[PDB]
DNA sequence: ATTTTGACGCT
DNA sequence: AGCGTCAAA
């Protein structure tokens, strides 16, 4: 009852670009824009296989990770535009200097966590403080909030989709209790108006399309997020979680998309989140941990206390290639050269990110996947990052695997490598 | 033969 | 330190 804590103490968003490696090159390429259209990487092999897809091309059918060959099946008019290659590999340095343009414009509204290359977390608790003073006790407008979904509404006593949208923002709208500035669901609307202002700064000072979630942790702004795509933001209140539960795979809840996700749903015998209510807390701690069993226990709630962590920047600066089928590695010769263009692109990244962001990297973290591993990672090894030297970071890299050579002849290697990773931890301040 | 990334937990 | 899990384009 009046002690038992309902995790409405923050107004959290989660903003996601939408299709965003298309949408960089859709900018760059005004041909490609309104078009079916994907982003490939590398076109040898079965046309290059697909990374992002337009949500026109979306309608067809494809999908990431298809083949462009295979995409084409399905849109016979996709249009594609291919990642840069340099020094013989996939280099994605476009999408990442665009993604900071994103997350730079973000960072003038509020503490923001990078959660990705096109996705941040934004902590809005202050600022709606802030702009619920400023308002004064004035009513919200529907005009304030012209892309914003409310979860769960319109409900009880239109058949297009803006329709429903407006029916239930005003039913939303009507129900506030705007006199009380401690209100949970004044907090939360509020937080929407701004995250429609901070949107539209995106998009008015980079061309990008977003959606966003707004709630009051950072699994519920991701998820609600993902509701109303592309170019719409979805707001999920405390009040809407029993109902939106009630039939939400429990895999699309971040975090129990995988085994962990899986092992709920055989072990309790269940489908959906709501349904976790009905375990006590120690009863989740003893199937799936103390740690996982709370967070269990207060998330199937709509309760979760993951703060939005302060960092815009990378912690990692890294680098890796595939030698898929035939074209594993199988010689010194091959090993030393991939070692080295991998060296050189990191080299060049971080010394842009010292510059830019004073910082320089102390660790080398080498990561090789030896032929025949179901893992994506075989072995793992790190060493000193002492200077920033393509040539010097290769040859470091090559002794601490180079042990890993079964062979028994000179300038052969086995088992043949499949992968090779490079990359740069543990960052100081310079 | 999805590939190329990034963060964080366990022991 | 090294391995595993989960997730983004
Ligand atoms: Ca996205
Ligand atoms: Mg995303």
Same mark, same amino acid.
């Given at each position: 009852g009046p002690h038992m804590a309902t995790?409405?103490?923050?107004?959290?968003?989660?903003?996601?670009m939408d299709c965003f490696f298309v949408q960089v090159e859709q900018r760059q390429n005004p041909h490609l824009r309104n078009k079916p259209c994907a982003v490939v990487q590398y076109k040898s092999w079965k046309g290059g296989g697909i990374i992002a897809v337009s949500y026109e091309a979306r309608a067809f059918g494809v999908t990431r990770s298809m083949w462009a060959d295979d995409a084409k099946k399905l849109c016979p008019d996709l249009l594609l535009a291919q990642v840069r290659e340099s020094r013989g590999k996939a280099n994605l340095t476009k999408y990442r200097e665009a993604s +900071? &343009?994103?997350? *730079?414009?973000?960072?003038?509204?509020? +503490?923001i966590e990078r959660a990705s290359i096109d996705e941040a977390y934004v902590d809005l608790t202050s600022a709606v403080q802030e702009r619920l003073q400023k308002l004064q006790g004035q009513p919200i407008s529907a005009d304030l909030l012209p892309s914003t979904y409310? &979860?769960?509404l319109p409900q009880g006593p239109t058949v297009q989709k803006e329709g429903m949208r407006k029916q239930g923002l005003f039913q939303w709208l009507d129900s506030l209790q705007i006199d009380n500035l401690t209100s949970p669901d004044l907090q939360l609307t509020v937080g929407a108006v701004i995250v429609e202002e901070m949107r539209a700064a995106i998009e008015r000072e980079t061309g990008f399309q977003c959606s966003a979630g707004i709630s009051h942790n950072k699994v519920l702004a991701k998820l609600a997020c993902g509701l109303n795509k592309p170019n719409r933001q979805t707001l999920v209140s405390h009040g809407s979680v029993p109902q939106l539960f009630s039939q939400m795979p429990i895999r699309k809840i971040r975090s129990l998309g995988g085994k962990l996700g899986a092992s709920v749903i055989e072990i309790l015998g269940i489908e959906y989140m709501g349904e976790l209510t009905q375990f006590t807390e120690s009863q989740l701690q003893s199937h799936f941990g103390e740690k996982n069993g709370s967070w269990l226990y207060a998330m199937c709630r709509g309760i979760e206390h993951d703060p939005v962590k302060?960092?815009?920047?990378?912690?990692?600066?890294?680098?890796?290639?595939?030698?898929?089928?035939?074209?594993?590695?199988?010689?010194? &010769?091959? +090993?030393?050269?991939?070692?080295?263009? $991998?060296?050189? *692109? $990191? *080299?060049e990244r971080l010394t842009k990110d010292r510059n830019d962001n004073d910082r320089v990297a102390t660790q080398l973290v080498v990561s090789i996947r030896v032929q025949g591993d179901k893992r994506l990672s075989s072995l793992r090894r790190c060493c000193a990052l002492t200077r920033y030297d393509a040539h010097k970071m290769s040859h470091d890299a090559f002794? +601490?695997?180079?042990?890993?050579?079964?062979?028994?002849?000179?300038? *052969?290697?086995?088992?043949?490598?499949?992968?090779?990773?490079?990359?740069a931890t543990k960052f100081s301040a310079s």
């Open positions: 995790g409405q103490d923050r107004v959290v968003a989660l903003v996601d +900071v &343009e994103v997350m *730079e414009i973000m960072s003038r509204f509020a +503490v409310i &979860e769960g302060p960092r815009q920047l990378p912690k990692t600066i890294g680098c890796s290639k595939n030698f898929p089928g035939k074209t594993a590695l199988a010689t010194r &010769e091959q +090993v030393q050269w991939w070692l080295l263009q $991998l060296a050189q *692109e $990191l *080299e002794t +601490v695997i180079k042990n890993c050579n079964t062979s028994g002849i000179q300038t *052969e290697w086995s088992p043949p490598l499949t992968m090779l990773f490079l990359c």
